[PDB]
Amino acid sequence: YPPFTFSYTYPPYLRTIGKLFGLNPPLLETAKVLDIGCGIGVNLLNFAETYPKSQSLGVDLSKTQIELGKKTISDAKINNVELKALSILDLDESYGKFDYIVCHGVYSWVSQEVQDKILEVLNKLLNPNGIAFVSYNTLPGWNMQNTIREMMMFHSEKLQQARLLLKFINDSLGNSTTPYANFLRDEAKLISTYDDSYVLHEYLGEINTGTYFHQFIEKAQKNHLNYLGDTSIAAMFIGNLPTKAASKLQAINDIVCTEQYMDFITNRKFRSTLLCHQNIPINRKIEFDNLKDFYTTFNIRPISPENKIDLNNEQENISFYYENLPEPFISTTSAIMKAILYVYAENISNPIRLEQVAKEAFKKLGKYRLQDFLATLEQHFITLIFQGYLKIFETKPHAIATITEKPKTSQFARYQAKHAHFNNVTNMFSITNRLNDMIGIPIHEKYILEMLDGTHNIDDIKKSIIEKINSKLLTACDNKGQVVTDPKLLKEFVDYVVAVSLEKFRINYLLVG
Amino acid sequence: PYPPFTFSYTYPPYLRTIGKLFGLNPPLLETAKVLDIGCGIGVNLLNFAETYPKSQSLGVDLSKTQIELGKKTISDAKINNVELKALSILDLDESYGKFDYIVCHGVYSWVSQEVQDKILEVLNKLLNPNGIAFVSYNTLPGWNMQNTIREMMMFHSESKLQQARLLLKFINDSLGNSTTPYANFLRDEAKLISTYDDSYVLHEYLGEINTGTYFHQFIEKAQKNHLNYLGDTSIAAMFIGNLPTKAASKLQAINDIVCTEQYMDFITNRKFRSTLLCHQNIPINRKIEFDNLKDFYTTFNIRPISPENKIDLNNEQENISFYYENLPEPFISTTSAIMKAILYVYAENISNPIRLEQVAKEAFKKLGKYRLQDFLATLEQHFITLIFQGYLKIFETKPHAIATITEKPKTSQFARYQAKHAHFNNVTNMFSITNRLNDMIGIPIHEKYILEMLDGTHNIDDIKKSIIEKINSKLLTACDVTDPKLLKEFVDYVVAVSLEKFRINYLLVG
Ligand SMILES: [Ca+2]
Ligand SMILES: [Ca+2]
């Protein structure tokens, strides 16, 4: 019963990919979504909280999981989602047709029958412009993995014996061997670092299977479905690979042959694939006229602040940071570039449009013309949004980066603060932000989260945390070793830790206002 | 039409060699009865059939065309020892009887699970008490990358051997020197399909459909069928201990053969296995005693760097090297004078198997100093582990061939026949011949014209004259064109070399 939330199964992200490629996805405000294999179904809750007029239906097999998730829906007071226990073959019609459909990690785990019937239902239960999402493993990535699995299995006949296998692999492959075994000790050494839940569920768990992109897309194309794209935009991106070859891949117009080849070179283990009704055209052309309407986010830190460096000279090279990540990205030289960079640093985790990025750069540096700023943008930014560095939205997420006087957080994250699932190995609680992304939360922040309903000012917070220090609960430490941090020097310690925690909540999309 | 291949490791005397290595007592070769399943043309039975006239062989294959063509090749080769027929693998166990050696090569992975196990049932019934069976199959995991690449082009080709090569090119191109996590492995195996030949890559990758299996799933299926695992026909494959030590000792400590070997498949990514099976009523001795290894005919194929006459053998300050089969890089060296003599009698006898005790003898006579047990002792110290690394070959018994040039050189009636038709690897090299070890040797054209010429009727002068006759008339061209007084001296060379190549390849029967 692991609860998870995924930012790429979020309806507002699916709509971003759809409207990115020229589709016309339905409205989010009234949207109807369906989760097949919902389990607990918290993946549906965030959206439901953000759009109260959007009804949602999860359907799972397990009655224990469905009945648990129903409790979590009552506890959090959510009216927008209903969950039922129904086998997929009990899914036909007579509820309705949904604007968004999410099938996540249940496709490769079921029989050939239901493997066809999932695409069947997704045909009949979808809507004309609706977007379908299906996650499955792939070949030939399933090969090396699956044969590692049969190795750990072939040994035993608990979880530890697998880690001792993988150990034994890395000595057996120790630095006398190097044809292939550089691929084995690599992949296996990657398998060894993983959560004991993940190794148990995937490798030592039930029986899943990898499939082929052309076999899957082909199985949908007989079900009247067309391939939209992937949630990973940095995935389908071509090159990398040399221009003399990439020119051949781009020369042909086929998405299935280009992608199906990209898996073959990259050894792609999984895929998260979007589908639409085949009656609809997709625009694979990237039209900058449409890209100025998509909100942008670049996570970047300044090396030197604006005030202390006047950049009009264009005599300098200024590195910044990307997510820090100490050694930074490329850097100018040209000021019509920097002026875009520093407005991306001002707006960090605060989405603004692409054109308004260009404008704000034109106001920060007022030497040049706007449409030349767009010449920089359209020139090269796209390559960053298709390499995964720059996020794109349309529409702007519901959240704010400003710290209000009585901060407030989503009811879903404020509920999650109470019931959050602790994990060791790093002492953290997983909390869902407005992007459906899971955030590591230190405990002393877990007490701050449930404290923001908008009722409490920052003084009741910086007070309460102190109370939990002296009343511990929370133990505060100076540098000296165990110091326990006694009076009025505590009061300036809490000002800092709370002032930082609220900032983390500001730039992680945890602040609703 | 079809590739006519003969394989050195399906030879019955080789299966006997591996049996006697493990303490078994395989049957007699002279009268031996052998069965070939999936025989195809049946050229695998022929070389052994002509070498041992008292031995009867029976090939069986589903294809009627292949069987008939086989019968033609037989009758033209004047071989009465082998009979071919067309039968589904099921219909056996009839008056066909029991055979001392059974060979199933290439049909196991290619047929249904039913016909799959039925091969092992038939193998149980038709095998004599001490007889040995041979079965080859594609093994997981190593079969997993091929079936991707073999699918990778099978995906392209619909849009054969032409476009696929362009696929492989496009592949090695797509990986630039800036992409190297894994793609080194891809780039490697794909770079390896650029090797081989149109025959192989045609029937294996594009013809299909075959499947891979696991070692324990075979050995188990045969243990279900009352057959026990003898080993593999690659002696280098059963040898572990190249991996680290701390892990090695842990692998030996268990003493479970199937577990160790299939772990080997796991970390070495094994594509193929050629497996020997025997009756589980026979104990197999996996402990190899040198005293049992000095009854084997042994071959270390080596050329000296320095000829023996220009070197003093007892100088312990001098370092001499040799070669292994050339192999442009030198192989070993010494120093030790007792070792030098061993290496020079092993280099003199290259491709002339002799017994280990006899090696210690002729080494004793080459430099007489110490006691015979000292030479035999160095061979015990480090001369083995070379036979398990694959560099030293063991026989028992001495093959029928000759290491000397007979003034009217003669060849196998099978090889002299093969030369006319033979096979071409135009991918691009040379024809394919079968020597007395059932190994296929690359033979150029000008050496094929010499090969058809050795029946024992002509001497070396007639070879030279015939080659010179075919030069100017070309046919055979000699570059760098030339005149008569040079042409004679040049043909003398390529001839006397073509005879040494035959001599040390076991192509000279007298
Ligand atoms: Ca004559
Ligand atoms: Ca001469």
UniProtKB/TrEMBL annotation, chain A:
Record flagged with keyword Calcium: yes
Residues involved in Ca(2+) 1 binding: D460
Protein keywords: Calcium, Metal-binding
Signal peptide from the UniProt entry: none
Ranges where the Methyltransferase regulatory domain occurs: 195-277
Pfam family for this entry, one: MethyTransf_Reg
Superkingdom of origin: Bacteria
Amino-acid positions noted as binding S-adenosyl-L-homocysteine in the UniProt annotation, renumbered to this chain: D60, I88
Cytoplasm is among the record's keywords: no
UniProt-annotated binding residues for Ca(2+) 2: E492, D495
GO MF: metal ion binding
Location of the Methyltransferase domain: 31-143
Stored InterPro entries: CFA/CMAS (IPR050723), Methyltranfer_dom (IPR025714), MeTrfase_reg_dom_prd (IPR018773), SAM-dependent_MTases_sf (IPR029063), WHD_PKMT (IPR048976)
Domain PKMT C-terminal winged helix per the UniProt entry, residue ranges: 405-510
PANTHER family xrefs: CYCLOPROPANE-FATTY-ACYL-PHOSPHOLIPID SYNTHASE, FATTY ACID C-METHYL TRANSFERASE
Protein name: Methyltransferase
